[PDB]
Amino acid sequence: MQDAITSVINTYDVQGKYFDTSAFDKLKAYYATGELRVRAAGTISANAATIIKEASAKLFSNQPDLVRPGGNAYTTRRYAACVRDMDYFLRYATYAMLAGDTSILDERVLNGLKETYNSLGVPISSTVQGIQAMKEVTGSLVGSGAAKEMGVYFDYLSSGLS
Amino acid sequence: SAITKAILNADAEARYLSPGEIDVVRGYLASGERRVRVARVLSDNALRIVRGAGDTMFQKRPDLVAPGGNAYGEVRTAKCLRDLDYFLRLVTYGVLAGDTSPIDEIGLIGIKETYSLLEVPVPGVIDGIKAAKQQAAALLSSEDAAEASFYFDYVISAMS
Amino acid sequence: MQPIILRTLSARRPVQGRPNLETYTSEVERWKAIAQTQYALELAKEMSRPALRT
Numbered sequence: 001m002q003d004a005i006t007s008v009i010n011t012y013d014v015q016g017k018y019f020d021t022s023a024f025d026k027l028k029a030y031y032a033t034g035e036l037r038v039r040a041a042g043t044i045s046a047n048a049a050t051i052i053k054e055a056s057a058k059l060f061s062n063q064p065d066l067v068r069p070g071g072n073a074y075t076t077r078r079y080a081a082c083v084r085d086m087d088y089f090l091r092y093a094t095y096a097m098l099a100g101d102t103s104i105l106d107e108r109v110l111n112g113l114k115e116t117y118n119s120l121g122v123p124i125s126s127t128v129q130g131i132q133a134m135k136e137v138t139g140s141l142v143g144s145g146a147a148k149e150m151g152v153y154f155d156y157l158s159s160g161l162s
Numbered sequence: 163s164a165i166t167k168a169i170l171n172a173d174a175e176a177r178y179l180s181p182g183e184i185d186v187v188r189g190y191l192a193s194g195e196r197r198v199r200v201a202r203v204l205s206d207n208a209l210r211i212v213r214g215a216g217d218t219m220f221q222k223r224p225d226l227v228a229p230g231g232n233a234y235g236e237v238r239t240a241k242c243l244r245d246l247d248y249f250l251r252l253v254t255y256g257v258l259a260g261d262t263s264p265i266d267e268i269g270l271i272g273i274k275e276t277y278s279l280l281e282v283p284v285p286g287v288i289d290g291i292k293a294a295k296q297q298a299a300a301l302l303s304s305e306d307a308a309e310a311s312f313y314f315d316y317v318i319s320a321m322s
Numbered sequence: 323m324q325p326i327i328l329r330t331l332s333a334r335r336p337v338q339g340r341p342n343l344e345t346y347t348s349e350v351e352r353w354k355a356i357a358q359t360q361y362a363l364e365l366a367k368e369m370s371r372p373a374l375r376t
């Protein structure tokens with residue numbers, strides 16, 4: 001995967017150039033945001049279970065037919081698969097927020113996920129709604145600046161599945 | 163410990179410590195003074211932290227010590243407060259080592275099935291641990307409180 | 323009590339309502355477009371890099 005630093009290194013290495021002023025500006029920007037990212041990642045890891053509980057509660061309240069008979073999240077096994085999926089989405093969004101880069105979502109999450117969901121009969125719009133619910137809860141817990149940071153990766157996941 | 167993790171990573175690849183790993187070890191050895199300060203403050207104040215956390219836990223959840231509660235009676239309340247003291251000691255160990263390896267080895271691995279077979283309410287334990295976190299933050303400075311709260315929150319999240 | 327003291331003087335502002343801001347909104351949208359161009363240029367620079375040279 002790539003972080004902001006590795007993205008800059010990749011650009012300058014493929015171009016064959018040493019770091020210029022603009023590269024140093026980009027690296028300063030990532031270093032400046034590093035403290036905020038570490039704080040937000042710690043807050044999320046401290047609160048991951050609660051975020052999943054609130055997000056799945058809001059998703060299954062908005063769409064009660066998911067966890068009733070006939071719904072894709074009706075059985076203990078399919079409910080468990082659902083909340084596990086939400087947990088992985090949260091963890092990888094937290095990773096991508098630390099890295100300052102959405103590449104890990106491309107390498108570890110999105111590729112082939114739409115097909116798997118279509119093949120299993122998982123509702124994809126409902127999954128996007130669950131990801132949005134996690135976004136709302138996480139933004140509540142992390143604060144305004146960290147919320148604006150995490151929203152980028154949540155929306156990346158949402159648009160990738162949409 | 164942090165040094166243990168760096169060395170295990172270097173040994174997994176059959177190589178010497180890398181500049182990043184040497185930097186990690188140097189950062190831990192620099193933070194040692196602050197770590198010893200936080201651990202000392204939590205160690206000398208264990209009695210009051212556990213007493214206050216137990217008081218506020220039992221006030222938040224009186225049914226735990228009510229008849230038919232998991233901690234009803236003198237022996238079971240004693241074991242409950244002993245568990246809270248255990249977790250405070252583990253938080254001090256984690257603060258000293260710089261990772262959660264002592265916490266995981268001594269107290270966390272196997273706690274979930276232990277409390278499941280004992281039918282101990284994990285939310286009650288988490289209430290006591292959060293209470294201990296606030297008691298500790300009261301005795302610590304803001305940065306010391308944050309450092310302690312890292313390992314407190316690790317314990318809570320492992321319970322939950 | 324016989325000094326003339328004035329209590330309820332009318333205000334400077336007129337009684338009318340708020341004038342509409344459509345022209346101001348248009349100019350603000352122009353500023354937004356200008357600001358979006360300067361970030362879209364960087365991301366476009368990213369789009370035109372080769373495919374598999376990481």
Ligand SMILES: CCC1=C(C)/C(=C/C2=NC(=C\c3[nH]c(/C=C4\NC(=O)[C@H](C)[C@H]4CC)c(C)c3CCC(=O)O)/C(CCC(=O)O)=C2C)NC1=O
Binds near residue numbers: 060
């Ligand atoms: C067939 C497999 C299957 C099961 C079993 C199942 C149960 C289930 N119970 C739920 C809520 C609940 N379930 C309970 C039941 C508990 N409360 C008390 O503590 C009792 C000890 C205990 C019942 C004997 C309660 C109180 C709620 C409401 C919780 C809430 O409001 O969020 C929910 C969340 C959404 C909903 O209301 O339907 C599910 C999915 N779903 C399934 O697909």
Ligand SMILES: CCC1=C(C)/C(=C/C2=NC(=C\c3[nH]c(/C=C4\NC(=O)[C@H](C)[C@H]4CC)c(C)c3CCC(=O)O)/C(CCC(=O)O)=C2C)NC1=O
Binds near residue numbers: 233241245288290
């Ligand atoms: C140093 C690592 C370590 C830990 C962490 C540990 C926890 C632990 N607590 C136990 C009992 C217990 N633990 C509790 C604590 C509960 N009471 C309330 O409900 C609260 C929710 C909660 C505490 C906040 C209680 C009441 C018992 C007695 C339960 C019984 O015997 O039925 C037991 C079973 C053996 C015994 O009776 O001593 C273990 C293993 N033991 C260890 O060696």
